Design a protein around this ligand. Structure first.
Ligand SMILES: [Mg+2]
Lengths: 116, 142, 109, 48, 103
RNA sequence: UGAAAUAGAACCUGAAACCGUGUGCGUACAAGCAGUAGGAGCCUCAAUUUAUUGGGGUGACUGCGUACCUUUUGUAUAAU
RNA sequence: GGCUCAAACUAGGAGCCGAAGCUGCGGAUUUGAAACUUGUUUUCAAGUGGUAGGGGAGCGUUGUGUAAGCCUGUGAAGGU
């Protein structure tokens, strides 16, 4: 019962080369190089699923700091004032309000500043 | 709901004048660098230049504390063997006075293409006058 | 429409014929024929022969006016390689590739 | 008395054999359970 | 008119008739959910900030469907350690349409 | 002629490496395993009472990020 | 970078940032425990980094039977 490897080997290599579409040079063309580039891409993507949650909180905090300093407060006093006022609005939503609704963010700063 | 970026075409860059007369070099440079990067704006996105145009006058009258006028040294290498040159704060301010504040701010900016773009907005002039009255820059104490 | 001539198997490297092809691509038939008749490159005799054949095809098999024709598309492909042995010093041998090329020319309005 | 198509040996009757050196996921790839390069990892090795 | 609501351990600023993907809910398709723990209602120039919730305010949504998201390949690799492992993932979501915001 | 001629004699099918041509986007002030997470702009299909979404191509700009195997106490290793 | 009543040091205080830790939300899985009880159902508790290595469950491929079946020129295999 002799088994030829041609058809399965072909479809196996085509899966990897398909995942390597758009890569430079040998990285999208030749299997020995494509298979390393796909594995490294998956490794980076796994690490960056974690890191993106850090990067976006970084961004929200920056925008909230700018919004609060426009209203006369720093981030570390504004967040303390929210926690003292029992306001549960998350940083994602607070940054959205600071960016797209300046009067509402002014009202939130007023509440935090009255709490201090 | 998604967190949005500032969309470069929708960003406007405002013009401000800073009088450097008698201010501390590093303490003024931190504020200028923040303004150039756009950190005071609530649409701040790290990959978009949302900063302002800072025009600085009296750049030669910037101040340093301690003995830093005579003891702060600026080095450079020319690319040739033994080609390490050193100047002073005092001599640099005599020779090319805008270099002192330019160096302070350039070190405090991001070190990449967007950093190069955002230091273009720094306009330094030794003396009381600047040529940008057509841009109507507002006075910014900072 | 576009009328084709093929010159499969010219005894020359396609890398050499490509420099000739790049200069006649897109030009009118007259300008391209001028370039080919006054080039000093061997690949130009092949490109000129294939272009002349394509013009004759467009005039005889399709009844086109060769006054409005142009080199609509041209490319050179690698042909079959003849493999030869080159002796070197110290009893060592090298392989020699005697490359050939295929020239495809399409002329059209 | 069923079909030839639907007789089964029953659970526990059959075990699949181990094949050494068929990749990482099998748990027996590369060295095939022999560990690293000593006398025991070599081909005609025994326990004398 | 917009409100800040909670679903799935996350917060959402929402407006009326908006289609929102949230973590999977144990709620039948087409049914209406009422959220009575809204954090803020801004219906113009009037801002009601809850401490922590805006009492009386409520957001009614309706469940459009429950779906699975885009497949993610999770790739783990320890170099020189004869170790590799891949895994697939599709995250469940429920899609809500915000039907009403009552301040 | 033939059902078929990119079945035309190097002739069934006709993969990949490799090498062309065409179209779209990017790219000539910027430093590194070439991806990844984001992300503007453009191009193209569809809807949609009409520049908004959805799919596809490209990827300015930002963060992070020194291949794989083997062998090792330990390798981006300038070790195999 | 730059810093001098500091952006240094000493002694205190209050805020905040900060990890794949903890919590929240959704999903999977190992073991054990309870009950329509060989996945029939729901739960609960503790778990789920991993080389050498041990244990468990499967995918595909060629061939034999099932098969004088079933599919297939109204298009098989292979290719893309
Ligand atoms: Mg053939």
């Amino acid at each position: 019962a002799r088994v030829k490897r041609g058809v399965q080997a072909n479809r196996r290599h085509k899966k990897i080369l398909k995942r390597a579409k758009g890569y430079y040079g040998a990285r999208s063309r030749v299997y020995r190089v494509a298979v390393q580039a796909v594995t490294k891409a998956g490794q980076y993507a796994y690490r960056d699923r974690r890191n993106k949650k850090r990067t976006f909180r970084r961004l929200w905090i920056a925008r909230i700091n700018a919004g609060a300093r426009l209203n006369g407060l720093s981030y570390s006093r504004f967040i303390n004032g929210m926690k003292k006022a029992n306001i549960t609005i998350d940083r994602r939503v607070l940054a959205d309000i600071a960016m797209h609704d300046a009067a509402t963010f002014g009202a939130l700063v007023e509440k935090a500043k009255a709490e201090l | 709901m998604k967190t949005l970026s500032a969309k470069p075409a929708e960003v406007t860059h405002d013009w401000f004048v800073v009088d450097a007369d008698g201010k501390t070099l590093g303490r003024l440079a931190t504020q200028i660098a923040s303004r150039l990067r756009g950190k005071h704006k609530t649409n701040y996105t790290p990959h978009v230049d949302t900063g302002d145009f800072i025009v600085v006058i009296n750049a030669e009258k910037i101040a340093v504390t301690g003995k830093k006028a005579q003891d702060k040294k600026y080095y450079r290498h020319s690319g040739y063997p033994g080609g390490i040159k050193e100047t002073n704060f005092t001599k640099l301010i005599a020779h090319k006075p805008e270099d002192v504040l330019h160096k302070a701010v350039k070190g405090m900016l991001p070190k990449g293409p967007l950093g190069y773009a955002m230091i273009k907005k720094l306009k330094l002039y030794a003396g009381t006058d600047h040529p940008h009255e057509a841009q109507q820059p507002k006075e910014l104490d900072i | 429409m576009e009328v084709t001539a093929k010159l499969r198997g010219a005894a020359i490297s396609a890398q050499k014929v490509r420099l000739v092809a790049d200069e006649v691509r897109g030009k009118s038939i007259e300008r391209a024929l001028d370039i080919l008749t006054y080039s000093n490159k061997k690949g130009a005799v092949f490109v000129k022969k294939c272009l002349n054949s394509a013009i004759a095809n467009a005039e005889h098999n399709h009844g086109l006016d060769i006054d409005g024709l142009k080199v609509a598309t041209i490319y050179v492909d690698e042909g079959i390689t003849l493999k030869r042995i080159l002796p070197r010093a110290k009893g060592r041998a090298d392989r020699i590739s005697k490359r050939t090329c295929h020239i495809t020319i399409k002329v059209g309005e | 008395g069923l079909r030839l198509n639907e007789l089964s040996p029953g659970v526990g009757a059959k075990k699949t054999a181990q094949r050494r050196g068929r990749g990482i996921g099998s748990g027996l790839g590369k060295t095939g359970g022999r560990g690293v390069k000593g006398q025991k990892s070599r081909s005609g090795s025994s326990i004398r | 008119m917009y409100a800040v609501i909670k679903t799935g351990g996350k917060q959402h600023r929402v407006v009326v008739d908006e289609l929102l993907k949230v973590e999977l809910l144990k709620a039948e398709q087409g049914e209406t959910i009422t959220f009575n723990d809204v954090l803020m209602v801004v219906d113009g120039e009037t801002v009601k900030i809850g401490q922590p919730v805006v009492d009386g305010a409520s957001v009614e949504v309706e469940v459009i469907e429950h779906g699975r998201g885009e497949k993610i390949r999770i790739v783990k690799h320890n170099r020189r350690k004869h170790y590799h492992k891949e895994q697939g993932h599709r995250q469940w979501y429920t899609l809500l349409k915000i039907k009403a915001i009552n301040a």
